[PDB]
Design a protein around this ligand. Structure first.
Ligand SMILES: [Ca+2]
Ligand SMILES: [Ca+2]
Ligand SMILES: [Ca+2]
Ligand SMILES: [Ca+2]
Length: 138
């Protein structure tokens, strides 16, 4: 159990855009020896197996329940929706080694049940932000 992340998705087909809001996380795994992590969240837009664009939040120091409230806009033509995946990875920044992966969420029509439900809800509710909590998976 790696933690959970609360995020919203808002897709506007007329503008060919999605807004991904990384809201907050809870109960993150501690990936530093003293019982904390320094979390930031990266958001990768994929088209088929290609990386299109990457965005990331600030880093919160020594915080297993960070609150971000950061909003990221991506261009996504309606014609590319079926081939789109949004991969969200919560990371632990480290000074003296490679940053550690806390966990990931994959958003598309071909992911886990909660993820697919959130994606379909976004599609069904154009221009409405839809927020859900997801379990982070290693
Ligand atoms: Ca670490
Ligand atoms: Ca760290
Ligand atoms: Ca490390
Ligand atoms: Ca590093």
């Amino acid at each position: 159990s790696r933690g959970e992340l609360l995020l919203s998705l808002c897709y506007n087909p007329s503008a060919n855009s999605i807004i991904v809001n990384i809201i907050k996380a809870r109960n993150l795994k501690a990936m530093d020896i003293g019982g904390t992590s320094d979390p930031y969240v990266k958001v990768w837009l994929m088209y088929k197996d290609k990386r299109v664009e990457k965005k990331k939040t600030v880093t919160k120091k020594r915080n297993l329940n960070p609150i971000f409230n950061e909003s990221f806009a991506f261009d996504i033509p309606t014609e590319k929706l079926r081939e789109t995946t949004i991969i969200i990875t919560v990371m632990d920044k480290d000074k003296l080694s490679r940053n550690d992966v806390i966990g990931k969420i994959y958003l598309s029509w071909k992911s886990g049940p909660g993820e697919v439900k959130h994606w379909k809800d976004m599609i069904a509710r154009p221009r409405q932000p839809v927020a859900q909590w997801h379990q982070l998976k290693a």
